[PDB]
């Protein structure tokens, strides 16, 4: 999805 939805995450 993305980092900025959730850092090293998403």
């Given at each position: ?6 850092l090293?995450?998403?």
């Amino acid at each position: 999805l993305e980092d900025g939805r959730t850092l090293s995450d998403y």
